[PDB]
Amino acid sequence: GMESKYKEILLLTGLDNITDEELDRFKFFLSDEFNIATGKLHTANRIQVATLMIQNAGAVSAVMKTIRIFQKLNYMLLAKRLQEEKEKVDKQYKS
Amino acid sequence: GMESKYKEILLLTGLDNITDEELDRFKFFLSDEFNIATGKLHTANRIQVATLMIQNAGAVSAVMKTIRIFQKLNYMLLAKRLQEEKEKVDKQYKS
Amino acid sequence: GMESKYKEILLLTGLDNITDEELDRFKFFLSDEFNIATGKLHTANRIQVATLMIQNAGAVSAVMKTIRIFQKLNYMLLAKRLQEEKEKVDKQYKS
Amino acid sequence: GMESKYKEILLLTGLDNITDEELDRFKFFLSDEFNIATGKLHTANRIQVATLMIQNAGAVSAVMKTIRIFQKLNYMLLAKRLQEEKEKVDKQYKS
Amino acid sequence: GMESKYKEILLLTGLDNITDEELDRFKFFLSDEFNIATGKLHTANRIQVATLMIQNAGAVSAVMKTIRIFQKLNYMLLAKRLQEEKEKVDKQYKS
Amino acid sequence: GMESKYKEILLLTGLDNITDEELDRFKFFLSDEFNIATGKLHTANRIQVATLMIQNAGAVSAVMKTIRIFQKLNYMLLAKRLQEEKEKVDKQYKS
Amino acid sequence: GMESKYKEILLLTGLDNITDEELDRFKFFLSDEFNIATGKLHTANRIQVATLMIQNAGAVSAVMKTIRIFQKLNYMLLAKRLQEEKEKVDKQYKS
Amino acid sequence: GMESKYKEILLLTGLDNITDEELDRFKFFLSDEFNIATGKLHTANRIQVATLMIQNAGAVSAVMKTIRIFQKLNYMLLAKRLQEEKEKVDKQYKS
Amino acid sequence: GMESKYKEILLLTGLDNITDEELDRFKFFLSDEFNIATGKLHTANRIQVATLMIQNAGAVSAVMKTIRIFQKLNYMLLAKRLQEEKEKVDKQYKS
Amino acid sequence: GMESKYKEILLLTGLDNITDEELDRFKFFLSDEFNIATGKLHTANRIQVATLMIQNAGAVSAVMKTIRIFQKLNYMLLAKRLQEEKEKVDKQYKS
Amino acid sequence: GMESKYKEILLLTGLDNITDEELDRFKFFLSDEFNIATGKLHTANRIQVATLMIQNAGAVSAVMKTIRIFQKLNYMLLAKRLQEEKEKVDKQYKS
Amino acid sequence: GMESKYKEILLLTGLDNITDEELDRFKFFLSDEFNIATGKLHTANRIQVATLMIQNAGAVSAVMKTIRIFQKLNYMLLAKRLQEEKEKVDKQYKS
Amino acid sequence: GMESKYKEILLLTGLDNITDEELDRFKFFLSDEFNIATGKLHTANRIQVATLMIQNAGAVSAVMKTIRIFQKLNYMLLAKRLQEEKEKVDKQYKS
Amino acid sequence: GMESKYKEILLLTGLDNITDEELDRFKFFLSDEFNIATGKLHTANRIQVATLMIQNAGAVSAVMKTIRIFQKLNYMLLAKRLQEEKEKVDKQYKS
Amino acid sequence: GMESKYKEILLLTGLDNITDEELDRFKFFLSDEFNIATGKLHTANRIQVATLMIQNAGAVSAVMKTIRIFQKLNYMLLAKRLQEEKEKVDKQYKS
Amino acid sequence: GMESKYKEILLLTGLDNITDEELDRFKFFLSDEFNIATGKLHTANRIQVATLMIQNAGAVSAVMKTIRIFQKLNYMLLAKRLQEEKEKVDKQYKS
Amino acid sequence: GMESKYKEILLLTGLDNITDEELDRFKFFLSDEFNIATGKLHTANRIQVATLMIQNAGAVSAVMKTIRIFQKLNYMLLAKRLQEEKEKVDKQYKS
Amino acid sequence: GMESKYKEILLLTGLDNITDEELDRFKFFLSDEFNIATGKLHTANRIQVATLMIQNAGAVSAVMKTIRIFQKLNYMLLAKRLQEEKEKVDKQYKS
Amino acid sequence: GMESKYKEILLLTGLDNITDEELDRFKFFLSDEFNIATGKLHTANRIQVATLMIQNAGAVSAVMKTIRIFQKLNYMLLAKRLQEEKEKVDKQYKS
Amino acid sequence: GMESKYKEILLLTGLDNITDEELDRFKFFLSDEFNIATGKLHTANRIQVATLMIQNAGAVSAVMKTIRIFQKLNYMLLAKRLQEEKEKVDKQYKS
Amino acid sequence: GMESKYKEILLLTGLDNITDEELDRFKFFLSDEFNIATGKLHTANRIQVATLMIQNAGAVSAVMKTIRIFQKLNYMLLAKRLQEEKEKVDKQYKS
């Protein structure tokens, strides 16, 4: 169930709140944290980006490295919100 | 039929009468009343904004929260007009 | 033959004269007059919109409800032109 | 007959009213409610999605979990409409 | 001879005018009107679908239930055309 | 007579409702429940598959293990339908 | 002479109109109505099947049980046609 | 010799120019013009179809009813070509 | 000499032009026109079939009942050819 | 040879010079001039459209009705070019 | 009389229900249970096989070893049926 | 070749020399000289405007009516230049 | 020896190079050139076809009429090759 | 050997370098140069197309008419390449 | 029983969760781990791929090398899931 | 008795588990291990193949060379299963 | 090799250096130099434009007419650069 | 033994690694290297193709001409692999 | 003794290695080398064929003409093997 | 093993990192380095492109010419990365 | 890791701090330092500009030539900041 909650955190809170140019910055910094080939990243939307991130690193490190890339882009609000949702889920299932 | 009348109130009277900068203020205050992800709000036009509002909260609370956000922006004329159209429709179908 | 004339009225006079944003308003008000599922309306062009309207309500009520939706959008010129073409065809075949 | 009515609710009201990107979000959240292998979900259309949902969980829990996934995606209008149609059918055959 | 005319109505007017996705919707709603096993419906074309419908319910109830399923799919134009052809044949041989 | 009813359940309800790829999955899981040599399973159709299953395990355990393999393939609808038909026949002749 | 007419009904109308897979379904359901050993049914053609049916139950119960097995296979058209030919012969010689 | 020329017209001009799906439509409309049992039509190729048509109605009415069925399928080009070849042969031997 | 000509008509034109399955249909319908015991018909070839037909009914009624059985099997071409050869011989010796 | 020249006029000059949306308008107006079932028109390309037009009305009336439909779509340049090529071929072979 | 009943069990229930390839498997496993020379088994039919089995081991051990060879071939249905008939005869005459 | 020269006159001299607001005036006066649907004019650039003008009236009347619309907008310099280029081409090819 | 060379031409070059469907076309056109009864042609292979052709018309007219039937089937390559081999043998023994 | 070189020219240089839509144009223009029945052309691939062309006109006129059809489709590069390879082979064996 | 559990792991968890393009990558990397001839891999589906893998290396090394190839394709989620299911089965039967 | 057990291993485990194409590969590699004339191998089934192998090399070397040929065909699963059954029988009778 | 160098000149130097609106001007002037149907030009990118130009006129006249069209559009810099690269290649291979 | 090794090279390495369309190209080029009649090549599989090649030219020239035909089809990898296996066998037995 | 060795060469190596269709080709070419009446060849098996060949020409010319007929059928492998065995026997007894 | 490493370099590092338009440029420059027919390149994806490159030139020259084509497209980063991976593998296995 | 740090320097410090007109000056001076085709530069944003710079020259020379172009534009502050970040990274990883 923690997989599903990290899917909702990653897609619904994280990727849905960034704009299109911010999505292009995010795809510009995916290849330095994930070892994902950029040739399918180049035209992906938010759902395919979440599918490549969860598929290529797991949901836990997908959300954690999403926080890391959002801190690379100086998006302190969204990184703070993903840490709040992530700690609510870690409180939810790790306790 | 009340759904269609609230669609005409929301799009035709409400959103079509605000300008582009006023639309950007409106999108700036959508996220505090609707729980809509802003990443698709950022480049939406009036029709897509009405589609996200009606889709994400229903037409009744969409128009009512439109009145509320227009009162947050001190647009007393448009909020008064949406209350007039809304009470004409509530008189039309609720009686 | 009246089917073909109402096809020419609907596509050639009606839908071809509205712009793209006006087409999006038109698709925003199709679901309140036609019981058409919007999931295929969302990316349709004018030909597919005319195909769904004629397919889902017939050409006669398709053109008549096109006049009705154009009067919902306050497009009095195009609604007047569709009534002129529609009465020329009704004069043509109904007499 | 309740199977057929839940088929009409699921395909006609539920899946036909969501767009293509919303369908991709829906497929992104099918695997957390259904235990359906995603490799055939990835290129399915609405009919094949309804066939996998009804085939893999039954029509009743298919429509009920459709309401649940639509509430995960914050689609309160479509979830409300599926609850209205579902309660009309449960009133129709359960009474 | 009425069998042959209902074959021409069913295949030529009815099934040949629906598209491929509409054929998949039609096959999705065959099992609720015909008691036909879907395992051979899944890859059938229009001719094999007409053969299973006429074979499994007769041509008269095949065309009549084709009108019924087309009214389930909100295809009012094709259902109206099948009622026009069906009443021309019933006028042709029943009178 | 119970042999004939389980033949109608197995062939008519069970095997006729699965598609061709689902039949290939079913043949892929026959060898783990039946001790049937796969060399004649590889090109069999539904009738020859039913003949090898009834011939190699009897009709009762053929239908019961059909329910078991359909539950291995997560086909809850068809397994539920075979349990409904099987309990109608067990009610029919065992009572 | 009624024997010859039931031979023409059974072979010419009944068995010649079913296909090869339908013939295999028919042979799959012969053993539940006729007490015929299946070891010679397995490779028979339509003429040998008619010879075993007429030889093992008579032509009258052969055609009547052919109608019964065709109603087991949901072949309502062919069962209706065999009842029409059978009642034309029973009208022909029984009156 | 007219038999051989109508064989060349039927097989070489008529049946060889229709595709496979058009052949299945043709077999779907053979049973309404020829009184041929469909159970051997179902898997026949063009040569066996020509053999059943010439065998069951003669070559002259075989080609003439081929023109009639091609006009049922709205194949005006092939029906026109078969009338041209048929009138060249009737000019060839009838004069 | 008319006996020899009807032998050539029966064996050379009639029985040699039907195939093996058509020969089995012919043997299936010999017992209704000839009062021939089928136990020697079951493995006969065309020459032994002609010997039993000419031996058991004479050559004239053998060829005439061959035309009758070929019209029972809807073989209008071969029945027409046997009537043409039979009328050439009846013209040859009866005039 | 005039058939081949009208094929080159129809495919090479006529259909190859219209764009994809213009092809969809053309398919939208094929059903009013040709009695072609639209269910195969819906996904056809230019070659299959030319095959259905030449197959269903002949090449001469195919090109002439192509000029007529291009004049329905106000494509005066392409209709003028098809009349120029058509009159060059009619000058070529009719004189 | 028990000899005759075991003859009816062996030939009528046992050997008549196996197919030709199953008969060849049965002959392939006769030489390991009966000490029968295979040179006359190689072209025998079911009657000659039953004659060699009853002649070479008696009817009782013929039927019992038939059950044993059918259990070698995993034919649990036919072995179960031969045990049912064998126990009906042993109940019939041994009690 | 005169078609190409009028294309160079229309696009290169005529439409490329007017500004964006002048292009919007030009599109505002296209519908009174060309019978072009304005819904695609509304967002066209100079190349698409030239394509709709040449496509919908030919190059000769396209350039001549371009001169006429430029004289409606009081653009005497550009209308004079298009008459100079047009008379250089008419001198070039008409003499 | 010319008989043997025409046997090698007919079987080895002619009949061995045509496929199975082409062999069925060839058998479909044997009866118009050879007066061979088709009832043994229907299941013959290439060797039996060559035996009936050489037996029923001689090897010389067998190969020459093979060229003629191959020219009826528009097989210009194989007819050209049989004319080349036939003229090599006629050069070989006729000179 | 010239046959083999023209096979390599036709298949390897000619047909392998055209795409799928270009192959459909090529099949659309085969019937005007070859007298090949289109019913087997409709689903052929490049190898079967080369087999029908070489089989129905020889390799020399097959390649030469391939150049002619490629010049009908304005494929000057591939027609030039086939003329270069064809003249290299004609230089190779004709000199 | 461990064979059956590794079949369910390989087909149900492993191959059913990868998409079609991912299946083509998987087939692209089968030949480097299995010594399987690719000529039958090229058009196989998931069931035939699982049959060739289990047939050509056993189920244990089939699943283990499936994990290895999924780690070659950087599919860490599916490789982790196959290691979880594989260790649940090794815990299930190895302990 | 070891002869009978190796017969059950060879036919039941070995040859019955390979498919038809795998049987043709097996027959393709029989002649390199057995000195069996292939002219009777070419149309044999599994029982006749087992009869020629046991007849021509004995059951022990028949099963052992079956393992060897299955290892030539890279069928490691079936070769492993035949070694398991062979070592169970060698444990059974050699100890 | 000169073909490859003119491909690099045309795509890399010529078409890659023009913008999107300049590409639309270029496509607007392709039809006056190439006899290319514009219906596939309308949505092509630079690679498909280069493929249609090289395919429809050869690489040499493709680059030379590219220089000519660039001089029609007054692009003296790019036409000068294509003449410089073209003369470097003509110096490279023509000397 | 060299015959067996060249059989394993030809079937296992050579023909099993080419796909089905590549097999059809291979059969298209067999007739230019082997003097094999194509009428049995047309429906052969890889085993029958290897049987005709080894039967009609020997295994040594079969593998060597397989390398030659694979170099005609530009399959440098498979031709290189067959030369590697062929030189391993020639090293194995020729030294 | 040379008679016996040529019997073993002819029957065991030569005739036993050809298939049934190849035996029919061989019988088709026996009459051109042996002056054997074909009426007993038509149903002979390999042993009776060897008996007629050795009886009608001696064993030496029987084997030598067997090589000659196998070279007529392009069976270079079997002709080479018969020459190898024949030269081993001629080395065995002639030296 | 070097073949597998160059497969991983070519597909995983090289082709997966280029986008779709870059893939179309790559396919535009494949025909100048590989002698691959472009008709199957035109719709290939990255896996089929890698299969044609490795199949048509080997993996070593496939990767090396991939570096060469990437240097033709000025992709210095990807060419540098393929040289780094290629030298890591050449260090891995060549040392 | 130095690649990622130079990506953050180039995009985050360098390109994000210049305005839109300064970005147009930067694109105006990219073609003199990078050999990048300007046709895709013309509408690129900062992310696509960074992708073309890093893709076309590497990250190190991308940042260094960014400093060089910023010194061409007299942007001494941003060039100084990029030298400070670049020397912090060169201190970070080069020491």
Author numbering:
A (entry chain K), B (entry chain R), C (entry chain L), D (entry chain E), E (entry chain B), F (entry chain G), ...: 1 to 95
Authors' own words:
AIM2 (absent in melanoma 2) is a bipartite protein composed of the N-terminal PYD followed by the dsDNA-binding HIN domain (hematopoietic interferon-inducible nuclear antigen). The upstream PYD filaments then nucleate the filamentation of the PYD of central adaptor ASC (ASCPYD), leading to the oligomerization of the CARD of ASC (ASCCARD) to recruit and trigger the polymerization (activation) of procaspase-1 (ASC: apoptosis-associated speck-forming protein containing caspase-recruiting domain (CARD); CARDs are also six-helix bundles that belong to the DD family).
Thus, we first determined the cryo-EM structure of the AIM2PYD filament using an untagged recombinant protein. Cryo-EM images showed that AIM2PYD filaments are straight helical rods. The resolution of the final model was 3.2 Å according to the gold standard method. The diameter of the outer rim is ~94 Å and that of the inner cavity is ~25 Å. As seen from the ASCPYD filament, each AIM2PYD subunit contributes three unique protein–protein interaction interfaces. The type 1a:1b interface is largely composed of side-chain interactions, while the type 2a:2b and type 3a:3b interfaces involved both side-chain and backbone interactions. On the other hand, aligning the cryo-EM structures of AIM2PYD and ASCPYD filaments demonstrates their congruent architectures.
